[PDB]
Amino acid sequence: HMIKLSNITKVFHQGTRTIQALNNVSLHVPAGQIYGVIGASGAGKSTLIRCVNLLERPTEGSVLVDGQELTTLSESELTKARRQIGMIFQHFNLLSSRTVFGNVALPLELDNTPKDEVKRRVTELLSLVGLGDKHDSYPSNLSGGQKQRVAIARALASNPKVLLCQATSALDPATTRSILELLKDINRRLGLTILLITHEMDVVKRICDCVAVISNGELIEQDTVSEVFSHPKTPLAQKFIQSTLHLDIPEDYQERLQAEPFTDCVPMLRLEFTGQSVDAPLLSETARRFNVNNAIISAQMDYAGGVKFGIMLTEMHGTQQDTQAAIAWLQEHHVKVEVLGYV
Amino acid sequence: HMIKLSNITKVFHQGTRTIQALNNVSLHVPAGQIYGVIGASGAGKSTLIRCVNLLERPTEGSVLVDGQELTTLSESELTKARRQIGMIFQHFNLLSSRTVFGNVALPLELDNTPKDEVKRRVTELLSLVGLGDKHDSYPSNLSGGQKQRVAIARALASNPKVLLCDQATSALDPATTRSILELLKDINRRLGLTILLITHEMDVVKRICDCVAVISNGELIEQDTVSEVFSHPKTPLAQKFIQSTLHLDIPEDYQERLQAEPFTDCVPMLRLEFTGQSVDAPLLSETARRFNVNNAIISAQMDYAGGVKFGIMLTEMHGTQQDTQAAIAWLQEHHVKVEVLGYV
Amino acid sequence: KVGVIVGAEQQVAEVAQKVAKDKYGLDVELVTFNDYVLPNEALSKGDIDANAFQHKPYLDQQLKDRGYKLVAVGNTFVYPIAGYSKKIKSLDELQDGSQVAVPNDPTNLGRSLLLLQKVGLIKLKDGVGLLPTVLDVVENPKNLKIVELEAPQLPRSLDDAQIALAVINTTYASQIGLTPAKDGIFVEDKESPYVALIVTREDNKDAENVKKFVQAYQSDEVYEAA
Amino acid sequence: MSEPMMWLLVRGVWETLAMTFVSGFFGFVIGLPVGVLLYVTRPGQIIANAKLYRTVSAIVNIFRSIPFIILLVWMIPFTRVIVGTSIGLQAAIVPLTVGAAPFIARMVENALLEIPTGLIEASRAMGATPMQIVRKVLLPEALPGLVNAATITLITLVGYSAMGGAVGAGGLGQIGYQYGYIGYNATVMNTVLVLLVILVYLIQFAGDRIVRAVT
Amino acid sequence: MSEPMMWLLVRGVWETLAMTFVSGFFGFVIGLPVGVLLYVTRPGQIIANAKLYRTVSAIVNIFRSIPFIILLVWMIPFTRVIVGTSIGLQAAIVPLTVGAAPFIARMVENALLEIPTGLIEASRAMGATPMQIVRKVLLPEALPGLVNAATITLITLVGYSAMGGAVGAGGLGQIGYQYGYIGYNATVMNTVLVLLVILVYLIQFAGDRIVRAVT
Numbered sequence A: 001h002m003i004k005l006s007n008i009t010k011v012f013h014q015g016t017r018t019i020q021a022l023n024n025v026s027l028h029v030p031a032g033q034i035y036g037v038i039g040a041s042g043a044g045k046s047t048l049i050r051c052v053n054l055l056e057r058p059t060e061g062s063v064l065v066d067g068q069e070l071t072t073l074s075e076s077e078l079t080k081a082r083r084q085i086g087m088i089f090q091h092f093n094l095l096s097s098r099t100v101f102g103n104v105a106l107p108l109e110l111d112n113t114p115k116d117e118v119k120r121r122v123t124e125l126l127s128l129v130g131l132g133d134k135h136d137s138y139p140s141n142l143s144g145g146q147k148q149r150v151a152i153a154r155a156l157a158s159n160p161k162v163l164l165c166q167a168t169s170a171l172d173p174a175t176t177r178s179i180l181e182l183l184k185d186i187n188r189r190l191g192l193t194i195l196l197i198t199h200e201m202d203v204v205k206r207i208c209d210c211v212a213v214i215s216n217g218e219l220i221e222q223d224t225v226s227e228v229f230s231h232p233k234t235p236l237a238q239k240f241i242q243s244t245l246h247l248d249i250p251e252d253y254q255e256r257l258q259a260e261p262f263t264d265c266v267p268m269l270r271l272e273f274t275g276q277s278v279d280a281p282l283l284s285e286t287a288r289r290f291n292v293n294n295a296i297i298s299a300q301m302d303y304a305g306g307v308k309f310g311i312m313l314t315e316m317h318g319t320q321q322d323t324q325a326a327i328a329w330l331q332e333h334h335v336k337v338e339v340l341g342y343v
Numbered sequence B: 001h002m003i004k005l006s007n008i009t010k011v012f013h014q015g016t017r018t019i020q021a022l023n024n025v026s027l028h029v030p031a032g033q034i035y036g037v038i039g040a041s042g043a044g045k046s047t048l049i050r051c052v053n054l055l056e057r058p059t060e061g062s063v064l065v066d067g068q069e070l071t072t073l074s075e076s077e078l079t080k081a082r083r084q085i086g087m088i089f090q091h092f093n094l095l096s097s098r099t100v101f102g103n104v105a106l107p108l109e110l111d112n113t114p115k116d117e118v119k120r121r122v123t124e125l126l127s128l129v130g131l132g133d134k135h136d137s138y139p140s141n142l143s144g145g146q147k148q149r150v151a152i153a154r155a156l157a158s159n160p161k162v163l164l165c166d167q168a169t170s171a172l173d174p175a176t177t178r179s180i181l182e183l184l185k186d187i188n189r190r191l192g193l194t195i196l197l198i199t200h201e202m203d204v205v206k207r208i209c210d211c212v213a214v215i216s217n218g219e220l221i222e223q224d225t226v227s228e229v230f231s232h233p234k235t236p237l238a239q240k241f242i243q244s245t246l247h248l249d250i251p252e253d254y255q256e257r258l259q260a261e262p263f264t265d266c267v268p269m270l271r272l273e274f275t276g277q278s279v280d281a282p283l284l285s286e287t288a289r290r291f292n293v294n295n296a297i298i299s300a301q302m303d304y305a306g307g308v309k310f311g312i313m314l315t316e317m318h319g320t321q322q323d324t325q326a327a328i329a330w331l332q333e334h335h336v337k338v339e340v341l342g343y344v
Numbered sequence C: 001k002v003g004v005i006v007g008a009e010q011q012v013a014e015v016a017q018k019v020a021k022d023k024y025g026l027d028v029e030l031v032t033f034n035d036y037v038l039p040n041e042a043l044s045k046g047d048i049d050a051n052a053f054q055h056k057p058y059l060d061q062q063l064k065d066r067g068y069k070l071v072a073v074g075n076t077f078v079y080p081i082a083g084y085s086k087k088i089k090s091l092d093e094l095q096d097g098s099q100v101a102v103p104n105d106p107t108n109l110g111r112s113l114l115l116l117q118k119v120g121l122i123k124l125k126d127g128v129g130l131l132p133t134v135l136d137v138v139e140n141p142k143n144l145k146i147v148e149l150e151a152p153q154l155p156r157s158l159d160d161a162q163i164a165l166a167v168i169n170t171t172y173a174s175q176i177g178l179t180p181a182k183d184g185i186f187v188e189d190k191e192s193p194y195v196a197l198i199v200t201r202e203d204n205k206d207a208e209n210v211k212k213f214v215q216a217y218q219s220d221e222v223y224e225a226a
Numbered sequence D, E: 001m002s003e004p005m006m007w008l009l010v011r012g013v014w015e016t017l018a019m020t021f022v023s024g025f026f027g028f029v030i031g032l033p034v035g036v037l038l039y040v041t042r043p044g045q046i047i048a049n050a051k052l053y054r055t056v057s058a059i060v061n062i063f064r065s066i067p068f069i070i071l072l073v074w075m076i077p078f079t080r081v082i083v084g085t086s087i088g089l090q091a092a093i094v095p096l097t098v099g100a101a102p103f104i105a106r107m108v109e110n111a112l113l114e115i116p117t118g119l120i121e122a123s124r125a126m127g128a129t130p131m132q133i134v135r136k137v138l139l140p141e142a143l144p145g146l147v148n149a150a151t152i153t154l155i156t157l158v159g160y161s162a163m164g165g166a167v168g169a170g171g172l173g174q175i176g177y178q179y180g181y182i183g184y185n186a187t188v189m190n191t192v193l194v195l196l197v198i199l200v201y202l203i204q205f206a207g208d209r210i211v212r213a214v215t
Ligand SMILES: Nc1ncnc2c1ncn2[C@@H]1O[C@H](COP(=O)(O)OP(=O)(O)OP(O)(O)=S)[C@@H](O)[C@H]1O
Pocket: A012, A013, A014, A019, A021, A039, A040, A041, A042, A043, A044, A045, A046, A047, A048, B140, B141, B142, B143, B144, B145, B146, B171, B172, B173
C-alpha cells in the first residue's frame, strides 16, 4: 500500500468557533491504483489531500507514504520525501516570475538534473499537455485551462511515485479526455499512484479504481466506482449518490403531467438500475413480451464490473394494463421503477 | 435584445508573438434568455465574456447592453451601467478584508442602500446559497465551493439584469450544483434575468441553456439551440468538437473480448447515435418485437430537447447474425446512425 | 528669549543665565541653533531677544546679507584658535600633500584660512578680511588639502593617519589637554574681530531685560569660569 | 545624572515623541492621498491619467530632492504663518512633516502596487466609483502593507526628528549629541540610547501586533 | 559660478553619487540577507525560529535606534580598520552603509511579506530546500517590490549622504548648505537643487522602468 492514513483528525480555530474539518478518517491506497474523493462542499476533501502532503499537520493522526511515517519526521527528511510527491492545486499556484518552461523545470532543478535533461524532459511534458508552443509565455498571459495544464506538467516533472490532484475543472471535454488518457497510461506503465478530488462523477467513473465519499469531515464509505454509484449504503451516501443522478423531468413533461391516469394515457416512468446484468435484455424483452413501447426520453447508463447502472426516463406506450404488467415484470428483475404521472 | 456583440476582434501581444484571441465574433442574447459558451481550451471564451463587461476592450468591435453602446461611453456612465451587470469570475476574486457577509454586501453598499435592507437581502442570499451559517467567516477559512457560492451571492446582490458566469459551478458537487442552477432558472423566469455562461460541463449546458455557442480559435463556429448544436451540428470543426463531448467508452472489458471478425454464435456490438429523432417513435422496442433481436443497453447518453431525443447508446444486438444485420438495416432506415464495432 | 549656538560656547552662556536669573530673576527662555543664520533670522523675525555667538565681520555679513538691523552690544572672551599636531612638534616637520583640518563653519573657516596664511604655508587672494574660503587659496606650495568638518571631529583627526595638522579652538584644545600657547605647536596672536559680540535687534536692544542679561553675561564669574 | 538632567531628558523624550508621532500623522494625512493618486493615475489604473501622474510624481521627486536644511529654511516664513514661530517644537514638526510626506506617498504607492489585479478588476466590474474603490477596496485590502509602512516610517522619524530638531527642539538625539557625546558623559549617552531602543521596540511591537491582527 | 566653483560642484556630484550608490549597494548586500531572515524565521515560515527572529529583529531595532552621529563616531575605529581612514568619501560611505542596512532589511521583509501564501505552500511541497526556495522563489517573485524599495532607498540616500558626508564629504548637499545658503549665492543654490532633482528623476525613472519590465 503506497499510502496509508490512520485516525486523522484536524481542527481549525477560525475565530469564535472551532471546526472539525476532519474527524478520525482512515484511507489506504495501493501502488498503481487510482482513487477518487467526493463529497458535498466544505466536507474536508482538500483538507485530507493536504494532510497527505502534510501541508496540514493533523492534530491527531498517522500518515504513511511509501512505508515512511511523516508526522514524526525531520524537516529535511520531509523535504526529501516531498520530492517524491507531485501536487496539483485547485488554483495551480504558478510562479509569475517564470515562464511555462520555467515553472515546469523547477522540480527538475531541485534535483540539480543536467541542463540538457531538463530541456528534453520539459519539452516532452509540454508536448504531452499540448502546451508545446507556449513554453516561453508567462502565467499572466494564459487561459485557465492552459495554466491548469502547466500545473499538471509541473506535478509530473520529477516522475513522482504519488500524485495529489479537481485537476481537470478548467479543461474542455476533449482536452479533459486527453489528459486523463495520459494519466491512465502513466499509471499502467510506471505504476503511478494517484489520489484525486473531483466534483465531476464523469471523471470518477472514467478512471478511478476505488472511490471514497465524505460528509462533515467523515469518510462515509469507500468502495469500487460501481458499488458506490450502485446500491450505496449509509443514507448520507446514498442520498449524495441520488443527488448525482439526473432527475430532470423536462419542463415540457412537467407541464403536461397529470397525477391521474386518463383514457389513452401514456405512463411516464423513471427507472433505476442498481447492479443489473448488462447481458440481461429487459426492455427489448419487455417490448417483445407485453407489446409495450418504451420510448427512452433520457438515459444515464454506465458499465463497471460487468454490470450496468444508472437511471433512465421513459414513456411506457400501450394499454394501461399492459403497461402495469410490464412494470411489474421489470420490478421482478430488480429494476427500481417509479411512475411519475400520465401524459 | 438585451445583449448584442458585433464584429468583435481582440489581439494580445504577449511577447515575440501576437495572438487573435477573438476574430470577428458576433452574438445576440434576448432578455431573460440563457445562453452557453463552449469550446476547446484557449479558444477565447473567457475573453469574449469579459468583452461584455468591457473588462477587455476590443480593438475593433461593438458592444451593446440594454441598448447602450459601451465602446463609446464615459468612465462614469460606464460605471453606472456596470452596476447593472453581475459577473462570476473563474477564481471568485473575493476580498480577504471582508467576511462572507461583507463581500456580499459590498455591491449594495455601492448603491448606498439602507443598512437594514443590506442585512435582510444579504441574509436572504446567504440562506439561498446555503451559506447562512458562514456569514461572518473570512474567505481564507472557506473551502472552494463555499467561496464560489460567496461569489455567486455577490453577483446576484444588486439584482442585475445580466449575469456573466465563468464556470460558476465548477467547484460545486452535483447536489449543490443542481440547487444553484435551479435558483438561476427560478430567477430567470421570475425576473426575466438574461444569462451568458462559460462551461466545460455540457451537462450544465443542456441543463439550463436556452441557446448555445461554440468557439474555436477565436471564432464563433456556430450558435443554435442546445439540441441543434448537440444534434446534427454543422461545420466539421463544430461536429468534431461535439463528437469530443460524446463518451464512446468501449469499456476495457469489451475491448479485450472484441473480434473484428464475426464467428459462429457471435453477438454484434454496435454504437448507435440519435440525432433529432422522434421521441414517441419506439424503435428498439419495435425492433425487438419485429426481428426477435435483443438490444442490451451497455451504456447510454440520451437527452431530450425541443421535442426530440439525441445522444449515443452502446448496445449488444442479440440473435442470429442475419437477424442482427436486418435489425441494423431497419434502424438505419429510421435515421439512427449505426456503427458495428465488432463481434463479442 | 535668547539665541545661542550648539557649539562649545554654551556653558559660557549657562553661567550667564545663572547670573541673570540670580541677580535679576528674569525667566529668559533659552534657545540653541545648529546652523549659522537662524538666530539672526529669529531676531529679525522677533522670536528671540538676543544672540551671543557671532563676531563683527560675521555680523556685518549678516547685516549685509538678508539685510538685518542689528548692532553689537557686548564684550567677549578671548576665544583663541591655533594649529595643532600630535604628529609633529614643529612646522619644519610638515611635508607636501599633508591634509589640514579646519572647522567647516564660516567664521572659524575663514579665521583658520587667515591663520594658515599667517603661518606662511598658503596665501589667498586680495581684499577679503576675516571670512575667506577655499575659493581663495591661490598659493599652496606644499599642496596641503583643506578639510571642512564639524569642529568636534578633527581633534581625533590629529590621530588620523591622513591628517598632519588641525586648526582647532582653545576649549576643544583643552578638552584633551593641549593649550595653544605652549602645548600647541603653533598659534594665533590677538585677532581682534573674532569677538563673541552679544547682539540684539536695533529696536529691542534698549529693553530692561536685554540690558540686565547683557550685564549678567559680563561679570567676574563668567570671566574666571571661562 | 542630576535632577536638572533628569528633567532635560524628560523634555527630550517629550520632544522626540511629539515630533515623531505628530509629524508621521500629518505626513500620512498628506502622502496617503498623494500615494493613492500615484497608484490610481498609473497607466492602467482606475483613474489612469499620464499627465496627472507625471505632475504628482514630479512634485514628489522635487520635494524629495531638496536637502532637509534648505527645506526647513525655505519653510521658515510659511512655518511662522502656520504656527506663529520658526523655533521650538511645532516649528520643527512642520518642516519634518513636509520632508516626510513624499516618502510616505511613495511607500503608499508601493503598498497599493502589491494589491492583486483581480480585485481591482472586480471593483471596476461591480461599478464602484474611484473613491468608492479607494475607501472600500484599495485601502482596506492594502491595510497590512500600509501599517508596516507606517511602522517603518515612524522608526525612521525618530532619528530624523533627532536631526532636524536643532531649531530649538532637539529631543533625545540632540541630548545625546550634546551631553552624551560632546563632553564625555557615558551615563547620559547610555540613558539616551536605552530610551531610544525602548521607543523603537515599542513602535515595532505595536506595528507587528496590528499587522498580525489583520488576516 | 567660477571655474573653481565648477570643479567643486563636479566633486560634490561625484561624492553624492559614490556615497549614495556604493552605500546603497552594500547596505543591500547586508540587509537583504537580514530581511530574508526576518521573513523566514517568522512564526509559520520556511525556517520558523522564534529565538532567531527575536535576535535578528533586536539587532535591527538596536542599530535603527542609534542616531547617525553616534553611529559614525563609534564606527570611526573600525571605519579606519576597513578603509584606513575616518575622513572623506569612503570613510563617509562606511557609516552611511551601516546606518542604511537595517532600514533596507525592513523594506525587504515588507516586500517578501507581500508574497502570496499558495506559492510558499507549493515551494515547500515540491521539496525545495530553504535556500532553494529563497533563490528560486522568494527573491524572484518579490522582485518588483524589491526594486521599488531600492528606488525609494537610493532617493533617500541622496540627502542622507548630503547630511552624513561632513566628515570630509557631503557632496552636493554639503555644497548647497555652505555656498548656496550660508553665503547668499542664489546661483550655486539653484544649481545644486537642479542637480539633485536630475539625480532623483534619473533614479526614479530607472526604478520605474525596471519594475514595469517585471510583469
Ligand atoms: N486553514 C483553514 N482555516 C480555517 N478553516 C479551514 C481551513 N482549511 C479548511 N477549513 C474549513 O474546513 C472545511 C473543509 O475544508 P475543505 O477540505 O477545503 O472543503 P472540501 O472538503 O475540500 O469541499 P469543497 O468545498 O468542495 S473544496 C471548510 O468548512 C473550511 O472552511
